[PDB]
Symmetry: C2
């Protein structure tokens, strides 16, 4: 799996630096760079509100059809309707994925985290992957599964960004010339960062939470001119989302519009800072670190198991998805018949019990005047279950045994649902599993505290999310703009830090674990302490030698180095040997396809390559080597490789440490890094495969 | 003015990489790195609450003494008391600055913005500079000047961080050995970033606003392991600030405790999204961009004028400060006698008029039942004037002429007060000057809008602050956590973007303008479009040649290159010439002071330099060259410069563009950057002075 070309070519023929164009062209580029950051936000807002409209309508008219048979004391008919509707929606949402785009499974972040690190993950931002991600997300979260549209919205935002960047689908591009400036690999990284923050803001209705999510976790080369377009895109997202909530008020769109603007609003509690509430807040942090470590350690084993079932065919995936949906629906209907009914309390002031699709003290098998504390949490859409656990001013609503049963159910569903072949997510199961033990500790303290148990559920959700994803700033800002409680922001990040620096003492993160399972070559930020005692010359003394071309290279050597080798960049020498730089494989296949062949070893002028090539044709990667067949009489001609050479590559000397070379490699971009000698002017090329610690430790095992 | 040594030395003798120490030492380092990030937050919270306690007590007992003579219809006695108390407080706050630490003047950011870019700004984070910054900030903002403790709190946080880093004041350091790990220049940059975000969070009571302020504007080398300590420090700051607000409730600390937790709370408005309120919000943005551009262009001329008065002696500074305070007090008392009294309205529901030190419809010369709309804004501490302009549910409280008079006064005071020799600031004058025209447009629209005029004042303040400082994310998060209005966050950054991308079309920022006035060599992020068509070899073909030392260099050449040259790093050769790397001046003076002299040209072993030096002694920069006198008989001995050489420097070749060399230079750190030839193995050193565009354009003026 290859990498991406971030390094700028400084030749005049390529016109890579956009400031060096004309004035009309820099006007058009500076207008299109903001028009696309507007349209990414506009379309991510429209598509997330379409997902929310369809999901709320489907889950509402499923739960109303369940409650109509609940109210007539027909429990088995309601169970058959529930399991049948869940099985049909999960069947559609996994048939589309396993038969039309098998890369749509899973969240999408653990890959966009690797695309923005330079790894060219293939077939990830297509058009059919976006459409089956949308329909699979609708049919998967409207089937009551323990997933969430939280994750897939990041991947849908990235696909919207890339389809706007290349001007449509991969084979139906519009031939607008003004989109020729975004054919690079730096503009794609900028657009996909805008789309990923656009997706996080569409998921959580939090603008700068999404900006900080793309800043801290997903992207890795942050620019201050990128911080102003990500800003604009999350702004247009949350404007479009709140405007289409406000238009669909008063039931003009059926359901979807009885919910409000901020999602899990608990901004009415006025949390205080008592000194006997230091012990339970650090207990929330310590237990969130331990449970996030244990949850990562078990989800690693579960995904290792699911990698065996995914290779046994395209029908074992569908059977696994339907079995997970069947077990989910059977548990979510049969488990609330174990918790006994507790009577209402008039000190809570909310209406209990309640019959309908909404939360707030639901009953389904209790007599009149009682309410079921399990069916408040189960038998509901998961957007309302977490509103029931974040319920301000509800002392002792849920018992200890019912919260234990809900916790022990959702810590199982979070393991077995993530990794199935439907578009899943990982924010919502951790939010539910964290709110469970947060309100468990809230009910366990009781009168010896002053923070509300709903805020203990918020602290439990944030503490498990930190202990399982190792994020600090994005989680505190996201929980601020989910909960609207500004006075909770100190204590809710005092709990994130204890959760993260307890969870770091046991395991890795979960994105690093999913990146390690998928084998993606992610370059870590800081080098190891043993990388400083190893030099680059010792690294190239354990490698095959560099293959090079000269400047006016014969066609036979170009064809030989293209057929026999898989390398994507070759240094150019002159055979007094003067190094020129690197030339890419993508330009070797271009001069072979263009029939730019010379008779003698003449080095050309500039106007010949201006007449042959154009700056737009040099960035089209729509080529392969198999279709071109060179005549064996014209394999003795000559190709002038001078005007296509990246004549200013980044070089290190053969005594630099591997640590400093890795720091340069990751800080600049740099698919390729030459190695010139200290005083054959090239003695090796370092790439991403050579600077990862797992490959270096296999060659020199006496280091660690 | 020199630079800082960020580049890590990879030798075993220095022990710069902290992971390569022992296990006990890495435990002690990982404990102290968080203990200092705790103590920075704890002490910045305690010192900002001491500033707030003293400022509120002094300004309260000054305004009560003014109001006691206002209520007895004695206006001239109140004017004499007001002008005398302001003149005494400004006299103390400028005498301390001009006679004890003249670097305490001005905000503090435009320098911490340059210290974190590597420029070693001298005498900036001392102990007397911190103490006179504290007392000057108290005596300057309690004198009613148009400044603010918003800025100086960044510099006080940075000084607290550096005094904790070096273990006390600059000549009273404690001799604790466990503070030897923070003697580097990377730990100082990390600590000062924690202290700067600590200061912004202590100023605005906004944690992640301060984190994003240190992320976007102040610091320039952001690390994800730094994002977790800045987090902790702003957390402890806002916890200590809110706890010492809550302890000082019910008047146990005199005043300071009748204000609340969040400062300018306007979270009761429920802003809507009408479609006829797109024209005035973009008018707020356009006028904020134009007024921020014009305010920068005039403050540049005013600071150019003040540079003449500052050089005419230490008494012209005091006369300028007292004249500014006199003009301020005469205007703030004499201007409200021009606005006529308007009667009360019962539809506003707040108590009008009010007599006291607080805001909310103040009267001072109106009869009973009326109120003065200018003295609501003037004659009050500026922390309450902006609460009066951000007043939710007050339609048409201030007229048009009174708001025009307040605007035309504060746009003059913001020019003439910033730059005087007291510890000033720049957030509060822009907040006041922006709220003025924000509520002016709110009163000008009237019934043709639905957003409250207090929210138009918030939009005007944010739009002028963006048009004059060119910040986006930090301003929207800071205005969120000042105003507590989460539903204002979309429109309040839709106005910041129009303000910033109108203001960018005219001028620079204001930090770049103050950095350009002080002549500090700030390295910009992206290179110019002409820097790609210039190579490093052409840069070194217009420079004096590199001076070098050999490896076992005689003492006479070391003394000659230390006396005759001012360079701080010399390449080491061997005269077959094998490059070793760079050696610093700070180690040349160390081997000259240590008397590590050899008789012959023997290259030593490792154990000799282990016996002479220690890893702590090699980082002590407490030396100068004038005190050491070498005997002329021992100037023919030899110094082994091998084991102190930075043997892995960052090298480029002599055909790299200046653009790519600048990108490497700024992305890695790098005080010094060698230039090795393509195929005398060194042909130059590039530093910060060579890669700035202003120095390159003076040598090759045919480029632009
Ligand atoms: C409503 C919200 C905003 C509304 C306004 C919509 C436009 C808007 O929000 O920003 C305006 C845009 C700014 O462009 P933007 O900041 O995205 O682009 C960066 C900017 O040009 C910097 O000045 C560049 O650095 P330098 O100079 O090389 O040092 C940087 O180069 P690099 O990072 O690539 O190295 C650029 O990426 O351009 C204008 O100011 C002129 C107005 C024409 C744009 C009009 C397009 C609609
Ligand atoms: C609110 C409570 C939270 C604070 C208290 C808890 C302390 C706390 O919040 O962080 C814990 C601390 C994390 O240290 P911290 O994250 O600051 O340090 C980074 C961390 O060690 C990374 O793993 C390093 O990267 P790598 O590994 O090289 O890849 C990185 O290296 P570099 O960036 O330098 O290159 C380090 O800077 O680790 C402990 O368990 C120390 C015992 C804690 C004792 C401290 C007690 C105060
Ligand atoms: N002439 C050469 N060009 C490029 N790589 C080379 C060459 N000679 C040896 N290598 C080494 O061969 C290994 C495999 O290289 P590979 O074919 O993956 O290059 P690549 O596909 O361009 O790498 P990537 O695209 O992942 O940056 C690398 O570790 C590289 O160091
Ligand atoms: N041997 C040398 N070492 C360092 N700089 C040199 C040398 N020879 C020439 N120069 C040049 O002389 C100019 C002035 O260098 P200066 O004395 O400011 O170095 P410096 O003080 O170490 O720089 P800084 O500390 O700002 O990084 C620089 O532009 C540098 O390029
Ligand atoms: Mg490859
Ligand atoms: Mg110097």
């Amino acid at each position: 799996i290859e990498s991406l070309d971030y390094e700028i070519n400084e030749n005049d023929l390529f016109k890579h630096d956009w400031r060096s164009r004309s004035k009309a062209q820099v006007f058009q580029y500076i207008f299109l760079k903001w028009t696309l950051a507007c349209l990414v936000g506009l379309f991510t807002g429209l598509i997330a509100t379409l997902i929310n409209l369809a999901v709320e309508n489907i889950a509402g008219y499923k739960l109303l059809a369940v409650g109509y048979y609940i109210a007539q004391d027909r429990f088995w008919t309601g169970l058959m309707v529930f399991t049948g509707a869940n099985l049909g929606l999960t069947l559609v949402a996994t048939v589309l994925v396993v038969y039309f785009a098998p890369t749509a499974a899973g969240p999408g972040i653990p890959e966009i985290k690797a695309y923005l690190n330079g790894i060219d993950t293939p077939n990830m931002f297509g058009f059919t992957t976006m459409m089956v991600k949308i329909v699979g997300s609708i049919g998967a979260v409207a089937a009551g599964l323990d997933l969430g549209k939280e994750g897939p919205l990041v991947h849908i935002g990235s696909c919207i960004a890339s389809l706007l960047g290349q001007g449509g689908p991969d084979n139906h591009r519009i031939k607008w010339r003004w989109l020729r400036y975004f054919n690079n690999d730096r503009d794609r990284r900028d657009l996909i960062t805008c789309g990923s923050a656009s997706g996080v803001c569409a998921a959580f209705r939090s603008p700068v939470g999404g900006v900080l999510f793309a800043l801290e976790e997903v992207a890795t080369w942050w620019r201050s001119a990128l911080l102003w377009r990500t800003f604009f895109s999350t702004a247009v997202v949350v404007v479009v989302l709140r405007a289409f909530i406000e238009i669909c008020n008063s039931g003009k769109c059926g359901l979807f519009g009885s919910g409000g603007l901020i999602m899990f609003d608990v901004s009415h509690v006025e949390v205080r800072y008592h000194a006997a509430d230091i012990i339970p807040v650090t207990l929330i942090g310590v237990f969130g670190g331990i449970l996030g470590s244990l949850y990562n350690h078990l989800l690693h084993k579960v995904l290792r198991l699911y990698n065996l079932i995914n290779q046994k065919g395209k029908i074992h995936k569908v059977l696994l998805s339907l079995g997970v949906s069947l077990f989910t629906s059977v548990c979510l209907f049969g488990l609330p018949f174990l918790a006994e009914c507790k009577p209402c309390d008039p000190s809570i002031d909310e209406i209990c019990p309640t019959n309908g699709r909404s939360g707030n003290f639901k009953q389904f098998n209790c007599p009149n005047g009682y309410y079921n504390d399990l069916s408040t949490l189960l038998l509901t859409t998961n957007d309302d279950a977490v509103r029931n656990i974040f319920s301000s001013n509800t002392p002792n609503e849920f018992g200890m045994v019912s919260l234990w049963i809900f916790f022990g159910l959702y810590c199982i569903l979070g393991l077995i649902t993530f990794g199935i072949a439907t578009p899943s997510g990982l924010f919502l199961p951790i939010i539910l599993m964290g709110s469970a033990y947060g309100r468990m500790l809230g009910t366990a303290m009781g009168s010896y505290t002053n923070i509300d148990q709903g805020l203990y559920a918020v602290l439990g959700a944030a503490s498990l999310m930190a202990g399982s994803m190792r994020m600090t700033v994005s989680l505190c800002v996201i929980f601020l703009e989910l909960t609207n409680n500004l006075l909770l922001l100190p204590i809710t990040m005092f709990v994130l830090l204890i959760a993260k620096t307890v969870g770091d003492s046991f395991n890795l993160s979960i994105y690093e674990i999913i990146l390690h399972l998928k084998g993606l070559p992610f370059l870590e930020a800081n080098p190891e302490p043993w990388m400083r005692n190893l030099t680059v010359g010792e690294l190239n003394d354990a490698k095959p030698p560099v293959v090079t071309l000269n400047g006016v290279e014969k066609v036979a050597n170009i064809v030989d180095v293209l057929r026999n080798t898989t390398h994507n960049a070759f240094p150019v020498l002159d055979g007094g040997t003067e190094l020129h730089g690197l030339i890419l494989r993508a330009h070797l296949v271009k001069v072979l396809k263009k029939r730019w062949f010379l008779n003698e070893k003449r080095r050309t002028e500039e106007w010949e390559v201006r007449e042959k090539f154009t700056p737009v044709e040099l960035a089209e990667r729509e080529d392969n080597f198999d279709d071109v067949a060179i005549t064996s009489s014209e394999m003795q001609l000559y190709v002038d490789l001078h005007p296509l050479t990246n004549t200013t590559p980044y070089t290190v000397v053969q005594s630099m440490s591997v640590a400093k070379a890795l720091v340069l490699f990751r800080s600049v971009g740099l698919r390729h890094l030459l190695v010139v000698p200290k005083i054959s002017p090239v003695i090796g090329i370092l790439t991403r495969q050579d600077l990862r610690a797992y490959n270096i430790l296999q060659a020199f095992p006496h280091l660690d």
